[PDB]
Amino acid sequence: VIPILMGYWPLNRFLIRVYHPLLLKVLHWPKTTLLVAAL
Amino acid sequence: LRHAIEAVPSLNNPQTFSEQKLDEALYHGAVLRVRPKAMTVAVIIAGLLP
Amino acid sequence: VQLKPGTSVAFSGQFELLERANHKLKLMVPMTLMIIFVLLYLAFRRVGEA
Amino acid sequence: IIRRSVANRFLVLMGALFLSIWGTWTIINTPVDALPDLS
C-alpha cells in the first residue's frame, strides 16, 4: 500500500558535520576501532 | 553501505595500492545515508519514551 | 404499582430476539453490496457500469 | 510484487478503505479487560 499513497502524495547539516571527522578518523585505523569496541 | 561500495569503486582495486577511492566510496555511503538512520533511531526512541 | 418485599418483575417475549436479529441484518446488508461493488468494478475497471 | 500492486492501485485503495472501516468497527466493538486470565 505504501508505494501507491506515496506516489499520490538545519538539522541534517549538523549531523553530517559531526559525523564527517569521526568517520574519517575511524576509517583511518579500523583495527583500533574494533579493539575499543571489544573493550 | 553495500549499494555505495557497489556503485562507484568496483574498478580501481584491481590495480594494487589503491585505497583513496575506497574511502570516498564509504564517505558517499555515509553522507546520503545519515538521514534515514537518524530518523529510524529517533522514531524508535520516541515511540518508546512515553 | 408498588412491589412487596421480596418480589420482582421482568419483561420478555419474541421482540427480545427480533430487535437483535434485525439489527445484525442491517450490519451485513451494506457489506454485501460493498463486496459486490469491488467485484463489478473489477469486471469493468470503471465505476459507471457498476 | 510491488509493480503489479501499483499497477492496479484503485482496487488496492478500495480494499484499504474497506479494511479501515472493518477495523474501526472491530475496535469500537472489542471487549475490554485489565489482565489476561492467569489462573
JSON list of C-alpha atoms in Angstrom, two decimals:
[
{"chain": "A", "resi": 1, "resn": "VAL", "atom": "CA", "xyz": [0.00, 0.00, 0.00]},
{"chain": "A", "resi": 2, "resn": "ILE", "atom": "CA", "xyz": [2.75, 2.50, 0.88]},
{"chain": "A", "resi": 3, "resn": "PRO", "atom": "CA", "xyz": [4.05, 3.00, -2.70]},
{"chain": "A", "resi": 4, "resn": "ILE", "atom": "CA", "xyz": [0.60, 3.93, -4.04]},
{"chain": "A", "resi": 5, "resn": "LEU", "atom": "CA", "xyz": [-0.26, 6.62, -1.48]},
{"chain": "A", "resi": 6, "resn": "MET", "atom": "CA", "xyz": [3.38, 7.77, -1.59]},
{"chain": "A", "resi": 7, "resn": "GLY", "atom": "CA", "xyz": [3.20, 8.39, -5.33]},
{"chain": "A", "resi": 8, "resn": "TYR", "atom": "CA", "xyz": [-0.16, 10.09, -4.84]},
{"chain": "A", "resi": 9, "resn": "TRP", "atom": "CA", "xyz": [1.28, 12.47, -2.23]},
{"chain": "A", "resi": 10, "resn": "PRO", "atom": "CA", "xyz": [19.19, 22.96, 9.53]},
{"chain": "A", "resi": 11, "resn": "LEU", "atom": "CA", "xyz": [19.39, 19.57, 11.30]},
{"chain": "A", "resi": 12, "resn": "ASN", "atom": "CA", "xyz": [20.97, 17.17, 8.81]},
{"chain": "A", "resi": 13, "resn": "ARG", "atom": "CA", "xyz": [23.87, 19.53, 8.09]},
{"chain": "A", "resi": 14, "resn": "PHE", "atom": "CA", "xyz": [24.79, 19.38, 11.78]},
{"chain": "A", "resi": 15, "resn": "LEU", "atom": "CA", "xyz": [24.70, 15.58, 11.78]},
{"chain": "A", "resi": 16, "resn": "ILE", "atom": "CA", "xyz": [26.92, 15.42, 8.70]},
{"chain": "A", "resi": 17, "resn": "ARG", "atom": "CA", "xyz": [29.34, 17.94, 10.20]},
{"chain": "A", "resi": 18, "resn": "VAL", "atom": "CA", "xyz": [29.64, 15.94, 13.43]},
{"chain": "A", "resi": 19, "resn": "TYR", "atom": "CA", "xyz": [29.90, 12.59, 11.60]},
{"chain": "A", "resi": 20, "resn": "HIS", "atom": "CA", "xyz": [32.49, 13.53, 8.94]},
{"chain": "A", "resi": 21, "resn": "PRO", "atom": "CA", "xyz": [35.62, 13.79, 11.13]},
{"chain": "A", "resi": 22, "resn": "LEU", "atom": "CA", "xyz": [34.79, 10.86, 13.42]},
{"chain": "A", "resi": 23, "resn": "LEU", "atom": "CA", "xyz": [34.04, 8.68, 10.38]},
{"chain": "A", "resi": 24, "resn": "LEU", "atom": "CA", "xyz": [37.33, 9.65, 8.73]},
{"chain": "A", "resi": 25, "resn": "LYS", "atom": "CA", "xyz": [39.38, 9.03, 11.86]},
{"chain": "A", "resi": 26, "resn": "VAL", "atom": "CA", "xyz": [37.65, 5.67, 12.37]},
{"chain": "A", "resi": 27, "resn": "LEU", "atom": "CA", "xyz": [38.28, 4.60, 8.78]},
{"chain": "A", "resi": 28, "resn": "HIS", "atom": "CA", "xyz": [41.95, 5.54, 9.24]},
{"chain": "A", "resi": 29, "resn": "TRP", "atom": "CA", "xyz": [42.52, 2.86, 11.91]},
{"chain": "A", "resi": 30, "resn": "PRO", "atom": "CA", "xyz": [39.84, 0.12, 11.74]},
{"chain": "A", "resi": 31, "resn": "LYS", "atom": "CA", "xyz": [41.69, -2.33, 13.98]},
{"chain": "A", "resi": 32, "resn": "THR", "atom": "CA", "xyz": [41.82, 0.09, 16.91]},
{"chain": "A", "resi": 33, "resn": "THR", "atom": "CA", "xyz": [38.11, 0.75, 16.41]},
{"chain": "A", "resi": 34, "resn": "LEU", "atom": "CA", "xyz": [37.32, -2.97, 16.63]},
{"chain": "A", "resi": 35, "resn": "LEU", "atom": "CA", "xyz": [39.54, -3.26, 19.71]},
{"chain": "A", "resi": 36, "resn": "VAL", "atom": "CA", "xyz": [37.86, -0.39, 21.55]},
{"chain": "A", "resi": 37, "resn": "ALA", "atom": "CA", "xyz": [34.52, -1.92, 20.58]},
{"chain": "A", "resi": 38, "resn": "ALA", "atom": "CA", "xyz": [35.58, -5.23, 22.15]},
{"chain": "A", "resi": 39, "resn": "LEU", "atom": "CA", "xyz": [36.60, -3.30, 25.27]},
{"chain": "B", "resi": 1, "resn": "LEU", "atom": "CA", "xyz": [26.90, 0.94, 2.51]},
{"chain": "B", "resi": 2, "resn": "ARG", "atom": "CA", "xyz": [26.82, -2.04, 0.14]},
{"chain": "B", "resi": 3, "resn": "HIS", "atom": "CA", "xyz": [24.96, -0.07, -2.52]},
{"chain": "B", "resi": 4, "resn": "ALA", "atom": "CA", "xyz": [27.54, 2.70, -2.09]},
{"chain": "B", "resi": 5, "resn": "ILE", "atom": "CA", "xyz": [30.59, 0.42, -2.34]},
{"chain": "B", "resi": 6, "resn": "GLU", "atom": "CA", "xyz": [29.00, -1.40, -5.29]},
{"chain": "B", "resi": 7, "resn": "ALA", "atom": "CA", "xyz": [28.19, 1.59, -7.49]},
{"chain": "B", "resi": 8, "resn": "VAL", "atom": "CA", "xyz": [31.45, 3.53, -7.94]},
{"chain": "B", "resi": 9, "resn": "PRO", "atom": "CA", "xyz": [34.57, 1.77, -6.62]},
{"chain": "B", "resi": 10, "resn": "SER", "atom": "CA", "xyz": [34.32, -1.54, -8.50]},
{"chain": "B", "resi": 11, "resn": "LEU", "atom": "CA", "xyz": [37.11, -0.58, -10.96]},
{"chain": "B", "resi": 12, "resn": "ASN", "atom": "CA", "xyz": [40.16, 0.77, -9.10]},
{"chain": "B", "resi": 13, "resn": "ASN", "atom": "CA", "xyz": [41.01, -2.09, -6.71]},
{"chain": "B", "resi": 14, "resn": "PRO", "atom": "CA", "xyz": [42.33, -4.46, -9.44]},
{"chain": "B", "resi": 15, "resn": "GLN", "atom": "CA", "xyz": [45.24, -2.00, -9.59]},
{"chain": "B", "resi": 16, "resn": "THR", "atom": "CA", "xyz": [47.19, -2.75, -6.42]},
{"chain": "B", "resi": 17, "resn": "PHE", "atom": "CA", "xyz": [47.98, 0.07, -3.98]},
{"chain": "B", "resi": 18, "resn": "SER", "atom": "CA", "xyz": [44.65, 1.88, -4.47]},
{"chain": "B", "resi": 19, "resn": "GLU", "atom": "CA", "xyz": [42.70, 2.95, -1.39]},
{"chain": "B", "resi": 20, "resn": "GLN", "atom": "CA", "xyz": [41.91, 6.65, -1.98]},
{"chain": "B", "resi": 21, "resn": "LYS", "atom": "CA", "xyz": [38.64, 5.98, -3.84]},
{"chain": "B", "resi": 22, "resn": "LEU", "atom": "CA", "xyz": [37.76, 3.10, -1.50]},
{"chain": "B", "resi": 23, "resn": "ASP", "atom": "CA", "xyz": [37.39, 5.66, 1.31]},
{"chain": "B", "resi": 24, "resn": "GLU", "atom": "CA", "xyz": [35.46, 8.12, -0.86]},
{"chain": "B", "resi": 25, "resn": "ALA", "atom": "CA", "xyz": [33.01, 5.30, -1.61]},
{"chain": "B", "resi": 26, "resn": "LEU", "atom": "CA", "xyz": [32.35, 4.74, 2.10]},
{"chain": "B", "resi": 27, "resn": "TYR", "atom": "CA", "xyz": [32.04, 8.51, 2.53]},
{"chain": "B", "resi": 28, "resn": "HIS", "atom": "CA", "xyz": [29.38, 8.62, -0.19]},
{"chain": "B", "resi": 29, "resn": "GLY", "atom": "CA", "xyz": [27.71, 5.71, 1.59]},
{"chain": "B", "resi": 30, "resn": "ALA", "atom": "CA", "xyz": [27.82, 7.63, 4.88]},
{"chain": "B", "resi": 31, "resn": "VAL", "atom": "CA", "xyz": [26.74, 11.12, 3.73]},
{"chain": "B", "resi": 32, "resn": "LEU", "atom": "CA", "xyz": [23.49, 10.44, 1.85]},
{"chain": "B", "resi": 33, "resn": "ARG", "atom": "CA", "xyz": [22.58, 7.60, 4.24]},
{"chain": "B", "resi": 34, "resn": "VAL", "atom": "CA", "xyz": [22.74, 9.52, 7.53]},
{"chain": "B", "resi": 35, "resn": "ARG", "atom": "CA", "xyz": [19.20, 10.96, 7.46]},
{"chain": "B", "resi": 36, "resn": "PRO", "atom": "CA", "xyz": [17.44, 7.56, 7.19]},
{"chain": "B", "resi": 37, "resn": "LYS", "atom": "CA", "xyz": [19.40, 6.07, 10.10]},
{"chain": "B", "resi": 38, "resn": "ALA", "atom": "CA", "xyz": [18.94, 9.17, 12.24]},
{"chain": "B", "resi": 39, "resn": "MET", "atom": "CA", "xyz": [15.20, 9.13, 11.52]},
{"chain": "B", "resi": 40, "resn": "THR", "atom": "CA", "xyz": [14.92, 5.42, 12.32]},
{"chain": "B", "resi": 41, "resn": "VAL", "atom": "CA", "xyz": [16.73, 5.83, 15.65]},
{"chain": "B", "resi": 42, "resn": "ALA", "atom": "CA", "xyz": [14.74, 8.95, 16.54]},
{"chain": "B", "resi": 43, "resn": "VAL", "atom": "CA", "xyz": [11.34, 7.39, 15.84]},
{"chain": "B", "resi": 44, "resn": "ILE", "atom": "CA", "xyz": [12.34, 4.16, 17.61]},
{"chain": "B", "resi": 45, "resn": "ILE", "atom": "CA", "xyz": [13.33, 6.05, 20.76]},
{"chain": "B", "resi": 46, "resn": "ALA", "atom": "CA", "xyz": [10.28, 8.33, 20.55]},
{"chain": "B", "resi": 47, "resn": "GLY", "atom": "CA", "xyz": [7.75, 5.51, 20.18]},
{"chain": "B", "resi": 48, "resn": "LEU", "atom": "CA", "xyz": [9.05, 4.04, 23.45]},
{"chain": "B", "resi": 49, "resn": "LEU", "atom": "CA", "xyz": [9.94, 7.02, 25.65]},
{"chain": "B", "resi": 50, "resn": "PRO", "atom": "CA", "xyz": [6.28, 7.74, 26.60]},
{"chain": "C", "resi": 1, "resn": "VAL", "atom": "CA", "xyz": [-47.74, -0.16, 41.12]},
{"chain": "C", "resi": 2, "resn": "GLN", "atom": "CA", "xyz": [-45.86, -0.95, 44.34]},
{"chain": "C", "resi": 3, "resn": "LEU", "atom": "CA", "xyz": [-43.83, -4.12, 44.85]},
{"chain": "C", "resi": 4, "resn": "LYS", "atom": "CA", "xyz": [-43.99, -6.13, 48.06]},
{"chain": "C", "resi": 5, "resn": "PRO", "atom": "CA", "xyz": [-40.82, -7.11, 49.95]},
{"chain": "C", "resi": 6, "resn": "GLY", "atom": "CA", "xyz": [-39.30, -10.00, 48.03]},
{"chain": "C", "resi": 7, "resn": "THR", "atom": "CA", "xyz": [-40.94, -9.54, 44.63]},
{"chain": "C", "resi": 8, "resn": "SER", "atom": "CA", "xyz": [-39.63, -8.55, 41.20]},
{"chain": "C", "resi": 9, "resn": "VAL", "atom": "CA", "xyz": [-40.95, -8.01, 37.68]},
{"chain": "C", "resi": 10, "resn": "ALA", "atom": "CA", "xyz": [-39.38, -8.73, 34.30]},
{"chain": "C", "resi": 11, "resn": "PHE", "atom": "CA", "xyz": [-40.37, -8.47, 30.64]},
{"chain": "C", "resi": 12, "resn": "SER", "atom": "CA", "xyz": [-39.69, -10.79, 27.71]},
{"chain": "C", "resi": 13, "resn": "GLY", "atom": "CA", "xyz": [-41.20, -12.18, 24.51]},
{"chain": "C", "resi": 14, "resn": "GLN", "atom": "CA", "xyz": [-40.39, -12.65, 20.85]},
{"chain": "C", "resi": 15, "resn": "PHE", "atom": "CA", "xyz": [-39.48, -8.97, 20.40]},
{"chain": "C", "resi": 16, "resn": "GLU", "atom": "CA", "xyz": [-36.40, -9.53, 22.58]},
{"chain": "C", "resi": 17, "resn": "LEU", "atom": "CA", "xyz": [-34.85, -11.52, 19.73]},
{"chain": "C", "resi": 18, "resn": "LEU", "atom": "CA", "xyz": [-36.26, -9.53, 16.80]},
{"chain": "C", "resi": 19, "resn": "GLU", "atom": "CA", "xyz": [-34.65, -6.22, 17.80]},
{"chain": "C", "resi": 20, "resn": "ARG", "atom": "CA", "xyz": [-31.35, -8.12, 17.81]},
{"chain": "C", "resi": 21, "resn": "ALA", "atom": "CA", "xyz": [-31.78, -10.21, 14.66]},
{"chain": "C", "resi": 22, "resn": "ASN", "atom": "CA", "xyz": [-32.93, -7.24, 12.56]},
{"chain": "C", "resi": 23, "resn": "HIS", "atom": "CA", "xyz": [-30.02, -5.19, 13.91]},
{"chain": "C", "resi": 24, "resn": "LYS", "atom": "CA", "xyz": [-27.49, -7.81, 12.81]},
{"chain": "C", "resi": 25, "resn": "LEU", "atom": "CA", "xyz": [-29.06, -7.84, 9.35]},
{"chain": "C", "resi": 26, "resn": "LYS", "atom": "CA", "xyz": [-28.54, -4.09, 8.99]},
{"chain": "C", "resi": 27, "resn": "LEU", "atom": "CA", "xyz": [-24.83, -4.74, 9.57]},
{"chain": "C", "resi": 28, "resn": "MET", "atom": "CA", "xyz": [-24.40, -7.35, 6.81]},
{"chain": "C", "resi": 29, "resn": "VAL", "atom": "CA", "xyz": [-26.65, -5.85, 4.11]},
{"chain": "C", "resi": 30, "resn": "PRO", "atom": "CA", "xyz": [-24.24, -2.95, 3.39]},
{"chain": "C", "resi": 31, "resn": "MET", "atom": "CA", "xyz": [-21.06, -5.04, 3.49]},
{"chain": "C", "resi": 32, "resn": "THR", "atom": "CA", "xyz": [-22.58, -7.40, 0.92]},
{"chain": "C", "resi": 33, "resn": "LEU", "atom": "CA", "xyz": [-23.09, -4.56, -1.55]},
{"chain": "C", "resi": 34, "resn": "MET", "atom": "CA", "xyz": [-19.51, -3.49, -0.86]},
{"chain": "C", "resi": 35, "resn": "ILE", "atom": "CA", "xyz": [-18.04, -6.92, -1.58]},
{"chain": "C", "resi": 36, "resn": "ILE", "atom": "CA", "xyz": [-20.27, -6.92, -4.67]},
{"chain": "C", "resi": 37, "resn": "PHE", "atom": "CA", "xyz": [-19.20, -3.47, -5.88]},
{"chain": "C", "resi": 38, "resn": "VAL", "atom": "CA", "xyz": [-15.49, -4.28, -5.66]},
{"chain": "C", "resi": 39, "resn": "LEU", "atom": "CA", "xyz": [-16.27, -7.21, -7.98]},
{"chain": "C", "resi": 40, "resn": "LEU", "atom": "CA", "xyz": [-18.35, -5.32, -10.54]},
{"chain": "C", "resi": 41, "resn": "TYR", "atom": "CA", "xyz": [-15.65, -2.67, -10.89]},
{"chain": "C", "resi": 42, "resn": "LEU", "atom": "CA", "xyz": [-13.06, -5.43, -11.32]},
{"chain": "C", "resi": 43, "resn": "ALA", "atom": "CA", "xyz": [-15.19, -6.68, -14.21]},
{"chain": "C", "resi": 44, "resn": "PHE", "atom": "CA", "xyz": [-15.35, -3.31, -15.98]},
{"chain": "C", "resi": 45, "resn": "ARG", "atom": "CA", "xyz": [-12.48, -1.34, -14.38]},
{"chain": "C", "resi": 46, "resn": "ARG", "atom": "CA", "xyz": [-14.96, 1.54, -14.26]},
{"chain": "C", "resi": 47, "resn": "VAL", "atom": "CA", "xyz": [-17.37, 2.79, -11.60]},
{"chain": "C", "resi": 48, "resn": "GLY", "atom": "CA", "xyz": [-20.05, 3.94, -14.05]},
{"chain": "C", "resi": 49, "resn": "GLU", "atom": "CA", "xyz": [-21.07, 0.45, -15.16]},
{"chain": "C", "resi": 50, "resn": "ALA", "atom": "CA", "xyz": [-21.12, -0.91, -11.60]},
{"chain": "D", "resi": 1, "resn": "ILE", "atom": "CA", "xyz": [5.14, -7.85, -6.20]},
{"chain": "D", "resi": 2, "resn": "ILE", "atom": "CA", "xyz": [5.45, -4.07, -5.90]},
{"chain": "D", "resi": 3, "resn": "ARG", "atom": "CA", "xyz": [4.93, -3.15, -9.56]},
{"chain": "D", "resi": 4, "resn": "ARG", "atom": "CA", "xyz": [1.90, -5.41, -10.05]},
{"chain": "D", "resi": 5, "resn": "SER", "atom": "CA", "xyz": [0.32, -3.76, -6.99]},
{"chain": "D", "resi": 6, "resn": "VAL", "atom": "CA", "xyz": [0.85, -0.14, -8.05]},
{"chain": "D", "resi": 7, "resn": "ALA", "atom": "CA", "xyz": [-0.45, -1.15, -11.49]},
{"chain": "D", "resi": 8, "resn": "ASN", "atom": "CA", "xyz": [-4.00, -1.79, -10.24]},
{"chain": "D", "resi": 9, "resn": "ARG", "atom": "CA", "xyz": [-3.96, 0.80, -7.45]},
{"chain": "D", "resi": 10, "resn": "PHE", "atom": "CA", "xyz": [-7.70, 1.58, -7.45]},
{"chain": "D", "resi": 11, "resn": "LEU", "atom": "CA", "xyz": [-8.52, -1.90, -6.15]},
{"chain": "D", "resi": 12, "resn": "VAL", "atom": "CA", "xyz": [-5.79, -1.54, -3.52]},
{"chain": "D", "resi": 13, "resn": "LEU", "atom": "CA", "xyz": [-7.23, 1.77, -2.33]},
{"chain": "D", "resi": 14, "resn": "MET", "atom": "CA", "xyz": [-10.75, 0.33, -2.20]},
{"chain": "D", "resi": 15, "resn": "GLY", "atom": "CA", "xyz": [-9.51, -2.65, -0.20]},
{"chain": "D", "resi": 16, "resn": "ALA", "atom": "CA", "xyz": [-7.64, -0.34, 2.16]},
{"chain": "D", "resi": 17, "resn": "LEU", "atom": "CA", "xyz": [-10.79, 1.73, 2.72]},
{"chain": "D", "resi": 18, "resn": "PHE", "atom": "CA", "xyz": [-12.85, -1.40, 3.39]},
{"chain": "D", "resi": 19, "resn": "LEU", "atom": "CA", "xyz": [-10.16, -2.65, 5.78]},
{"chain": "D", "resi": 20, "resn": "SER", "atom": "CA", "xyz": [-10.15, 0.69, 7.60]},
{"chain": "D", "resi": 21, "resn": "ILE", "atom": "CA", "xyz": [-13.93, 0.59, 8.04]},
{"chain": "D", "resi": 22, "resn": "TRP", "atom": "CA", "xyz": [-13.86, -3.03, 9.22]},
{"chain": "D", "resi": 23, "resn": "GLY", "atom": "CA", "xyz": [-11.04, -2.34, 11.67]},
{"chain": "D", "resi": 24, "resn": "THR", "atom": "CA", "xyz": [-12.79, 0.71, 13.09]},
{"chain": "D", "resi": 25, "resn": "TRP", "atom": "CA", "xyz": [-15.95, -1.34, 13.62]},
{"chain": "D", "resi": 26, "resn": "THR", "atom": "CA", "xyz": [-13.99, -4.16, 15.27]},
{"chain": "D", "resi": 27, "resn": "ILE", "atom": "CA", "xyz": [-12.23, -1.63, 17.52]},
{"chain": "D", "resi": 28, "resn": "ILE", "atom": "CA", "xyz": [-15.46, 0.00, 18.68]},
{"chain": "D", "resi": 29, "resn": "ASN", "atom": "CA", "xyz": [-16.92, -3.49, 19.28]},
{"chain": "D", "resi": 30, "resn": "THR", "atom": "CA", "xyz": [-13.95, -5.15, 21.02]},
{"chain": "D", "resi": 31, "resn": "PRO", "atom": "CA", "xyz": [-14.28, -6.38, 24.64]},
{"chain": "D", "resi": 32, "resn": "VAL", "atom": "CA", "xyz": [-12.12, -4.94, 27.41]},
{"chain": "D", "resi": 33, "resn": "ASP", "atom": "CA", "xyz": [-10.30, -6.33, 30.44]},
{"chain": "D", "resi": 34, "resn": "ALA", "atom": "CA", "xyz": [-7.50, -5.46, 32.85]},
{"chain": "D", "resi": 35, "resn": "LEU", "atom": "CA", "xyz": [-5.22, -8.52, 32.74]},
{"chain": "D", "resi": 36, "resn": "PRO", "atom": "CA", "xyz": [-5.35, -11.81, 30.82]},
{"chain": "D", "resi": 37, "resn": "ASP", "atom": "CA", "xyz": [-6.58, -14.91, 32.62]},
{"chain": "D", "resi": 38, "resn": "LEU", "atom": "CA", "xyz": [-3.54, -16.21, 34.52]},
{"chain": "D", "resi": 39, "resn": "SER", "atom": "CA", "xyz": [-5.46, -18.72, 36.65]}
]
